[PDB]
Each structure stands twice: as C-alpha cells, then as structure tokens.
Amino acid sequence: TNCNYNLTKLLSLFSVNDFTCSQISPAAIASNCYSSLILDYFSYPLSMK
Amino acid sequence: TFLAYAQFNDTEVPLIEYSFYSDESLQYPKTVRVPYPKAGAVNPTVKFFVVNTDSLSSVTNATSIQITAPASMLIGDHYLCDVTWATQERI
Amino acid sequence: GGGWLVASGSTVAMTEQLQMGFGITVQYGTDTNSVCDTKIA
C-alpha cells in the first residue's frame, strides 16, 4: 500500500523466463507509481506456459 | 496422430488365489493371484488419457492429457465402458 | 444448493530447478499514488 520497490530487490534473484502484460508493458510495470500493488505467487511449470 | 489410453487401478481390489500344479516336475505348486472383484467387493478405478504421438521427443517425457469423467459419474463408483473416435480431432 | 460438488486434479512432474509464477495487478489514481503525498515528512 504505502512503500517503494526495486527489481534488483526481487527479480534478478530469479531466472526470468517469460514476462507478459496487459494494458501495461513490463518496462512501465517497473517504472510507474501506484495507489496499490498486488503480487500473487505460486509453483508453476514452464511446460504449461 | 493421437493415442488414447486407459489406466486401471486395482490397489484396493481383493485377490482371488488358487493353485497351479503345472508340469509333474514342479515340486511346490504355484499360487496364482488375480485381482478380481466379486459382487459388492471393492472395484478397480479408471482414468483416461490421450497423448499426441506426433510431438514425442527424446528430450522430454511425453505429455498425456487426462480427460476427466462427467460429474454425474464422479459422485460414486463408475466404469469407462466405450471409447470411439469421431474425427481426427474429436473423441 | 442441494447436489454435489465435484473436482478433479492433475499433476506435472517436478523439474530440477523449480519453476514459479507471479501475477501482478496495479491500481492507479485517484490522488494517492504512494508506491514508487499525504505524509508529514
């Protein structure tokens, strides 16, 4: 809700394989300022991309 | 193109056992064991799969897509009683 | 509701590395974009 974020902070830590957006681009998703931010995570196979 | 297959599970199905005597030279008879459900006993379960044989590969274990039974079957013991292909891509 | 609920579940063999999925949803506006103005400092 009220804080700020990096991608050094949690994305270079992984081997990113694919990165898709809607009504935004990944570049923007990294740049911009938001009222709210939601991060869902789970286990999931690349095989079911 | 596709190979559809069934998988049966006899894990909880009771064994029928009986003697096989064989040739006169077999000293101790063989006990044959067969999973066989008698009326009312626990039945085998069935699951159904389809694999695309054109996209097989040695780099990668094949992917079998499981096709799941209808809801009216899932609520209790059922069987898979018929498999018929309609077209190259309809089953 | 009066009937049954029914479900079925499928698996994929675990991979050596472990592969994950992350979904993001950002909300803009309406005058409070504080993830990067009503704070005292």
Swiss-Prot record, chain A:
Tree of life domain: Viruses
Record: glycosylation sites: N6
Name of the protein: Spike protein S1
Chain's role: Attaches the virion to the cell membrane by interacting with host receptor, initiating the infection. Interacts with host DPP4 to mediate virla entry.
From Swiss-Prot, chain B:
Post-translational modification: The soluble form (Dipeptidyl peptidase 4 soluble form also named SDPP) derives from the membrane form (Dipeptidyl peptidase 4 membrane form also named MDPP) by proteolytic processing. N- and O-Glycosylated.
Tissues of expression: Expressed specifically in lymphatic vessels but not in blood vessels in the skin, small intestine, esophagus, ovary, breast and prostate glands. Not detected in lymphatic vessels in the lung, kidney, uterus, liver and stomach (at protein level). Expressed in the poorly differentiated crypt cells of the small intestine as well as in the mature villous cells. Expressed at very low levels in the colon.
UniProt-annotated glycosylation sites, renumbered to this chain: N9, N61
Compartment list: Cell membrane; Apical cell membrane; Cell projection, Invadopodium membrane; Cell projection, Lamellipodium membrane
Induction: Up-regulated by IL12/interleukin-12 on activated T-cells. IL12-activated cells expressed enhanced levels of DPP4 but not mRNAs. Down-regulated by TNF. Up-regulated in migratory endothelial cells and in the invasive endothelial cells in tumors. Induced by hypoxia.
Family the entry assigns: Belongs to the peptidase S9B family. DPPIV subfamily.
Subunit note: Monomer. Homodimer. Heterodimer with Seprase (FAP). Requires homodimerization for optimal dipeptidyl peptidase activity and T-cell costimulation. Found in a membrane raft complex, at least composed of BCL10, CARD11, DPP4 and IKBKB. Associates with collagen. Interacts with PTPRC; the interaction is enhanced in an interleukin-12-dependent manner in activated lymphocytes. Interacts (via extracellular domain) with ADA; does not inhibit its dipeptidyl peptidase activity. Interacts with CAV1 (via the N-terminus); the interaction is direct.
Swiss-Prot/TrEMBL domain comment: The extracellular cysteine-rich region is necessary for association with collagen, dimer formation and optimal dipeptidyl peptidase activity.
Note: Level of plasma concentrations of the soluble form (SDPP) can be managed as a colon carcinoma diagnostic and prognostic marker.
General function of this protein: Cell surface glycoprotein receptor involved in the costimulatory signal essential for T-cell receptor (TCR)-mediated T-cell activation. Acts as a positive regulator of T-cell coactivation, by binding at least ADA, CAV1, IGF2R, and PTPRC. Its binding to CAV1 and CARD11 induces T-cell proliferation and NF-kappa-B activation in a T-cell receptor/CD3-dependent manner. Its interaction with ADA also regulates lymphocyte-epithelial cell adhesion.
Protein name: Dipeptidyl peptidase 4
Organism of this sequence: Homo sapiens (Human)
Shown part of the complete sequence: 221 to 311 of 766
